[PDB]
Design a protein around this ligand. Structure first.
Ligand code: DCP
Length: 580
DNA sequence: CCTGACTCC
DNA sequence: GGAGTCAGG
């Protein structure tokens, strides 16, 4: 059964062929400044295992890695590329990434290792990484013979699977999406991750000191009001205090007990002074635990930067996600939380943070795909879309739209953009499911093209088995035929929503590629730091801001051409907070 | 590991 | 809705 390979003591020329499957193995989950434990190369001449201390000190091997004309096929090339960047080594010529190929073919398979990808093509001559390295505390790199066989089997699987994966991508009309969008993007994400974002840790620490004082004060008030100490962070002890001791109304349950979500608590505040204090304690506690202490824990001491990892192969809509830290959920809506952004600063003296965001990209994409005459006209006039939606839903003029009317319309728009259910919209607006349905009905009367689109896309999903985005990203929807109303309805909502969210993801990814090219052409030092779904964050010398003010929005706006314009807003300043 | 809560888009 | 993190259990 064993797979033959050369356990090489040195690099030879036959290992440096112009086409190879390459494995550069980084076992730590967070690959920043992490060890490379082994290397495997499979090519027309054979299968090879190399020790990294050897290969990575060999000038011929390093040249080969960096030579764009030497083509490599890999799985999760970004992990290898970043780990190699920390060692001062450039990885070029990666022409196929099996992780990104599998992700595009079917994001729902949850492919996160070579074995899982291989199984899509009935190839099982490779073990799952979890089986080799173990999990959790028991996780460890195995002895060399076991390690080397595993890496060689992964390389062999990649070597064999490239053709069938590319063939299926071609059949799906997704090969350009892989080769021209996701693969080039992977390189850009690697650069962003490696650059990192500078943190003003002293400022974070000062905030933490103040929060600790405020938390102690509120905490003690809560105990006084409760007539008893308890763990406020325990949903169980808190529920006992609120709903048994203090006898507050139970307005909502969880599957295991009493709900204490903020929405519920706000409704209970009139009955007892403890409630507003718990809400305040929660708010401060979230900041302290997640955005002060949690952030400080992942700052690299050598440079005071944080280096996120963008998971490019996870979400079902084509979005990225961000981990360790997550830099896509830093507070902004409320001022107390927004101040956390003062801690994210430029990495060089006399540089600034520049932030550019699409204005209503999801609803603009919807206008385009649905060809809804009224929605397209609204965006061609660059109307405030929530005010316009209120005018239409309520049949009033602009100067008759009250704040609460605009709020209801905005909630409907939020619902369309995220594909939430009537129940969800009812919750969000604190109204009956019945009234939520009525809102949706008025929306479709004013936007009949959107109605027709939603009908048609659900039918298309049922017929084809999947829906697609503008650039041919796919999502399979097997639950669309379910005889369970809730399950089916969830799938119908995903059919409606994925082309919206997913096409918006496609567009910003293309914009990132275009922007990186333009910055290089223009010889700017500006570079990308972060993407937050519909916005891009850069830093640059202060002397580049005026140019960026023209260049960045233009590139973002021109990434695709739709039936409506795209519009990008932008700001800059001395910290991320000030880039507003 | 699971639940519940909460932060962003 | 759907990502990730925290805390509790
Ligand atoms: N072999 C292909 C063909 C297309 N695409 C993706 C990227 C393209 O930018 C996008 C749009 O393709 P087209 O411009 O070719 O449009 P089509 O002719 O395919 O029709 P439609 O876009 O309506 O599907 O689809 C792809 O990834 N691989």
């Amino acid at each position: 059964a064993k797979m033959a390979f050369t356990l090489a003591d040195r690099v030879t020329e036959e290992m440096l062929a112009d086409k190879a499957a390459l494995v550069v193995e980084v076992v730590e989950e967070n690959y920043h400044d992490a060890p490379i434990v082994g290397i495997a190369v499979v090519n027309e001449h054979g299968r090879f295992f190399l020790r990294p201390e050897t290969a990575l000190a060999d000038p011929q091997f390093v040249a080969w890695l960096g030579d764009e004309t030497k083509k490599k096929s890999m799985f999760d090339s970004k992990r290898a590329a970043v780990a190699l960047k920390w060692k001062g080594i450039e990885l070029c010529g990666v022409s196929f990434d099996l992780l990104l190929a599998a992700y595009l073919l079917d994001p729902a398979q949850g492919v996160d290792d070579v074995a899982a990808a291989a199984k899509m093509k009935q190839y099982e001559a490779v073990r799952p990484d979890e089986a080799v390295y173990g999990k959790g505390a028991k996780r460890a790199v195995p002895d060399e013979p076991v390690l080397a066989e595993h890496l060689v089997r992964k390389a062999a699987a990649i070597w064999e699977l490239e053709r069938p994966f590319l063939d299926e991508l071609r059949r799906n009309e997704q090969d350009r999406l892989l080769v021209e969008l996701e693969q080039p993007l992977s390189s850009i994400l690697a650069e962003m991750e490696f650059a990192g974002v500078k943190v003003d840790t002293k400022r974070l620490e000062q905030m933490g000191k103040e929060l600790a004082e405020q938390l102690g004060t509120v905490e003690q008030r809560i105990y006084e009001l409760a007539g008893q100490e308890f763990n406020i962070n325990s949903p169980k002890q808190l529920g006992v205090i609120l709903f048994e001791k203090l006898q507050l109304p139970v307005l909502k349950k969880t599957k295991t007990g009493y709900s204490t979500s903020a929405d519920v608590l706000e409704k209970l505040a009139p009955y007892h002074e403890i409630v507003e204090n718990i809400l305040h304690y929660r708010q401060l506690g979230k900041l302290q635990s997640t955005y002060i202490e949690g952030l400080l824990k992942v700052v690299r001491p050598a440079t005071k930067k944080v280096h996120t990892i963008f998971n490019q192969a996870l979400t079902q809509t084509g979005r990225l996600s961000s981990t360790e830290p997550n830099l896509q959920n830093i507070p902004i809506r409320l001022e107390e939380g927004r101040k956390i952004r003062q801690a994210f600063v430029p990495s060089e003296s006399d540089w600034l943070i520049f932030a550019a965001d699409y204005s209503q990209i999801a609803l603009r994409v919807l206008a385009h795909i649905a060809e809804d005459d009224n929605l397209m006209e609204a965006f061609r006039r660059d109307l405030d879309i929530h005010t316009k939606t209120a005018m239409d839903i309520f049949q009033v003029s602009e100067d008759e739209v009250t704040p609460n009317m605009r709020r209801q319309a905005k909630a409907v728009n939020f619902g369309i953009v995220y594909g939430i259910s009537d129940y969800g919209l009812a919750q969000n607006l604190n109204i009956s499911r019945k009234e939520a349905a009525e809102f949706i009905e008025r929306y479709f009367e004013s936007f009949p093209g959107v109605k027709r689109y939603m009908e048609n896309i659900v039918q298309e999903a049922k017929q084809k088995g999947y829906v697609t985005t503008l650039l041919h990203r796919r999502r399979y929807l097997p639950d669309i035929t379910s005889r369970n109303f809730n399950v089916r309805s969830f799938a119908e909502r995903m059919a409606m929503n994925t082309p919206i969210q997913g096409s918006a993801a496609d567009i910003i990814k293309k914009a990132m590629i275009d922007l990186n090219a333009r910055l290089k052409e223009e010889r700017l030092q500006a570079h990308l730091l972060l993407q937050v779904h519909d916005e891009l964050i850069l830093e640059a010398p202060k002397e580049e801001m005026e140019r960026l003010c023209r260049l960045v929005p233009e590139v973002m706006e021109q990434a695709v051409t739709l039936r409506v314009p795209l519009k990008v807003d932008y700001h800059y300043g001395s910290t991320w907070y000030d880039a507003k």
